[PDB]
């Protein structure tokens, strides 16, 4: 993990995410939306739970991206919760929650749920 | 459960649900949207897992409502997953998934998630 997590990850929609996993559980980096234009980049911050694993379990982690930068303000934030599995074909399997700020009346429809799998290729 | 589940349930938004829990795990009834006009009623079908409970656990259940009737076709369906707790103040605590039919491009945004608590009052 940590060294194994640090790097560029890609998902099946065309998004790219680049993270540095720090020694004491920190996850810092940027998320880039498709097109890959100069600033389809947003800041991401998260944490991972490092442990001794004598049974090949994955490393639990999560991160958040607020969809606001100097070109866009989508008034929403997404959190990804999942685990990192390293090896020949390392991947991060996640489930995410995307919440939009709404008025109280629309709070019932404020959160979407999905899943993403990220690979190094 | 079963006898305890059968009846009218109300949630915190103003929706009403009326179910009959059949002997062999069936859940059949109707869901009514706020206003409570003649047909804000949709059919609901589900199942519940009946067991001997010597430790006061809740009864797991779930049901589905397709949002189509003779006045509306909202092209979506919602499933509620939760448990029934009976007693003085019996309630059904749930988490739901509402999926809309979308084109493949919008499949990422097709499902919302929420939670509802239903009571007999």
């Amino acid at each position: 993990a940590e060294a194994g997590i640090t790097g560029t990850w890609y998902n099946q929609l065309g998004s790219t995410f680049i993270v540095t996993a720090g020694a004491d559980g920190a996850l810092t980096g940027t998320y880039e939306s498709a097109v890959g234009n100069a600033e389809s980049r947003y800041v991401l911050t998260g944490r991972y739970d490092s442990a001794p694993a004598t049974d090949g379990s994955g490393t639990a982690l999560g991160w958040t991206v607020a969809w606001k930068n100097n070109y866009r303000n989508a008034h929403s934030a997404t959190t990804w919760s999942g685990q990192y599995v390293g090896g020949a074909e390392a991947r991060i399997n996640t489930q995410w929650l995307l919440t939009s700020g709404t008025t109280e009346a629309n709070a019932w429809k404020s959160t979407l749920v999905g899943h993403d799998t990220f690979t190094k290729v | 459960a079963e006898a305890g589940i059968t009846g009218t349930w109300y949630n915190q938004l103003g929706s009403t649900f009326i179910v009959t829990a059949g002997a062999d795990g069936a859940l059949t009834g109707t869901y009514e949207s706020a206003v409570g006009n003649a047909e804000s009623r949709y059919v609901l079908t589900g199942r519940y897992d009946s067991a001997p409970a010597t430790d006061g656990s809740g009864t797991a259940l779930g049901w589905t409502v397709a949002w189509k009737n003779n006045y509306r076709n909202a092209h979506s369906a919602t499933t509620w997953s939760g448990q029934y707790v009976g007693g003085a103040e019996a309630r059904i605590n749930t988490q739901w998934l509402l999926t809309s039919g979308t084109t493949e491009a919008n499949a990422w945004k097709s499902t919302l998630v929420g939670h509802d608590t239903f009571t007999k009052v």
Binding site: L13, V35, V65, A74 | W108, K109
Partner: peptide, 8 residues
Amino acid sequence: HPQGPPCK
């Protein structure tokens, strides 16, 4: 939304 696929 910036989290989606290309719109293309």
